[model samples]
Target: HPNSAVLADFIPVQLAKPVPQRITLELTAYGFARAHCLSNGITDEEGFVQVYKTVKEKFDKYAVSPAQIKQRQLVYFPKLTDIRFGDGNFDIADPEPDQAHLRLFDIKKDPRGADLKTRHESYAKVVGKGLEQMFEGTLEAPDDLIHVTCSGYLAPSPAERMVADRGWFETTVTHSYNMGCYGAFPAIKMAHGMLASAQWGATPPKTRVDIAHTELMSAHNNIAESRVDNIISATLFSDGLIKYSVYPEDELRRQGLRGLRILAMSEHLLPDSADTMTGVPGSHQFVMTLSPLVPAIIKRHVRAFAVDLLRRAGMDFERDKDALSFAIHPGGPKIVDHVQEELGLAEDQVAISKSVFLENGNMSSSTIPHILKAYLEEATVGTRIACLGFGPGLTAAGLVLEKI
Candidate 1:
């Protein structure tokens, strides 16, 4: 079972960015309903779709109904396994899917002025537009592919209020923090560990799992800009969905899809450095005050952090970096190059990260998975891939995944 309240609250906090208006229309057209105007300023499209295909229905016409009329099984609801539901208590679709479906990515021009009424319908017509080519062609999933595990991450909605009558649990003001890049790291590392060990819950137990990380960053985009504000704002950031597959070391080698196996994790904090990077307060704002010296600070710590990360993988930084494919979080165009030059990453090593920044902008926590997926689809054999992210607390987190 998952941590229900924490996971529920998690959605609004990280990925609240406005739905790309185009995506909102596409999803609505697909028959999903508009649940609410997400704090993202963009709408959130939500609803359940029973997966029975049209062709499958004709054959059922001639088939006899079983005497028992065996109960139908919902695909995603059971998978969540977080919230308990008595009969008829919850909708057939799972809450996780509801949250997952909220992202409205697109390939065409922004659909800003379209009739808000027609948004969902249009969005559904082009669901998964920017990502249409993925999950197909060379990247087909095998029929026997097993879903070994599941977990979740959560924070609170920025709009939450500490109402006098609502009590502390019901009140939302206590939970706040733009969380920045490091925010996703904690959730990501949890999934990485689960995938590596294939273990869930307490250990000495079964191992094998699937992981998901979803954030609402659009709601947090810093809208106001001054000189210092613009510099802090330029960092690549966006809000979206995340799902990852993992396996035991032996299974990964046997089936492939094993890139970097997180070697170790290191964290650092620059004292009184809180103001250097922070999230400001606003209805749909997740702003920052990152000082110019921030990048320099990261450079100062890189040598030590890199050494520790490499040590965990039992490899040398200089020798392995050139050979390994890196999934560096595209924190920004400048941040990307700064980390690359400091780490001595070979040229073109961070092409995917660069592409992500250009294509989807910085999707915050959701950004890394997009880059990782790119690495998986494009990389050649014997390629080693590593992912690292940074955020408030002046924090940095990294993981190494290898392509088997």
Candidate 2:
């Protein structure tokens, strides 16, 4: 069973002290803004210092502030704070790649600056550190281990390394990769299906599956992409590392575990929206291009999806709507707000999710699990929770769970 409060008892993910909006603005200035002007033939020497200023202006106008995303990280050296945003304030030709005025990288490594390889290596190292801290003495081998990530993937993955290091030779390791924000849902589904196979007399009856999410969103951000989507992406997505377990109903009750009991789950891809949200492996990090239209797409299908998801669990949407708690993914600053208005949920009903995003930013797939953990702390026994998340494929995924 999972505990919402597991972070305190365990090695909760470390947030690099929050970097200010000015730092983020400065990074925005260094790239896209400069590139956009140069590509458009606006000579850096001739003029257009205002171009970079406008980019930062729009970034400040559109993105969340230090107040909203108070805690964040990158798991890289020199820290985001240590690097200056730019050189000559963008008055010169994006300057010769220098030691100062860089992205989520240290310039001393290369005058060309840090690319994908540099960021991902940092990701791999951070994952081991995060996992090792929590699994220090977790010797009771789980039947299966699901390594969740869209941020980083390497040969001899962090999960396998952990299993091998912990000597859980018999425990199956599953790579649940690339399924962006709604990532935890698929892992849970994997765990659920394995248990059913066990019930059907598989080679060994499965008892438990552990899922770990290591999303160094900080590592994947393209500091120089210079666009609204990238700006929103850079500020909204932050590093998150978390782990939780799934067990069959009887098994959990036997352990007297207190957490959200899986009840029913549903996932659907919205129409003509495959390109609306995407995360693809890039030469410089796993670059994600998100459409501003995403919320509108989610808003279009959210209500219908919610009704059908609730119905699958033998509940009526209109009747039980008020009685249910929510774990809507705060994909952006007001994403939770849009869902709240569409689903007609009370502010407090979705407060945990808003609070989680406010406290931790979006942890990719780990966001929902973190929300569930918080639910465990405040949700009384028998409290029903409805979860919804949006990701690539414009995929709308949901689950019905109960506190036990």
Instruction: Mark the regions of model 1 whose C-alpha exceeds 4 Å error after superposition.
Output: 1-179, 192-204, 221-236, 250-260, 270-272, 280-284
Across 1-404, the per-residue lDDT of candidate 2 in tens digits comes to 32211111112466355555455555545565556655566666535567766776877777677777765554432355345434555322232354232245422232223577766665666688788875765658988888999888888898899899888999999999988899988888887877777877875877678888888777665644666787788778877777888877777766776767777889988999999888777667676888989889899899999999999989999999999998999888779999999999999899999898888777788888789888877888889999999899989998898877
Clashes of 2: 3
Off by over 4 Å in 2: 1-11, 18-22, 26-51, 77-112
Worst 10 residues of 1 by lDDT: 3-12
Tens-place lDDT per residue, model 1, 182-255, is: 54556544445444342444444322333333343432322223233332342223445544544455544455
Local distance difference test, each candidate: 0.43, 0.74
Clashes of each: 45, 3
TM-score versus the correct structure, for each prediction: 0.53, 0.86
**Model 1 lDDT on a 0 to 1 scale:** 0.43
Report residue 206 deviation for candidate 2 (angstroms).
2.2
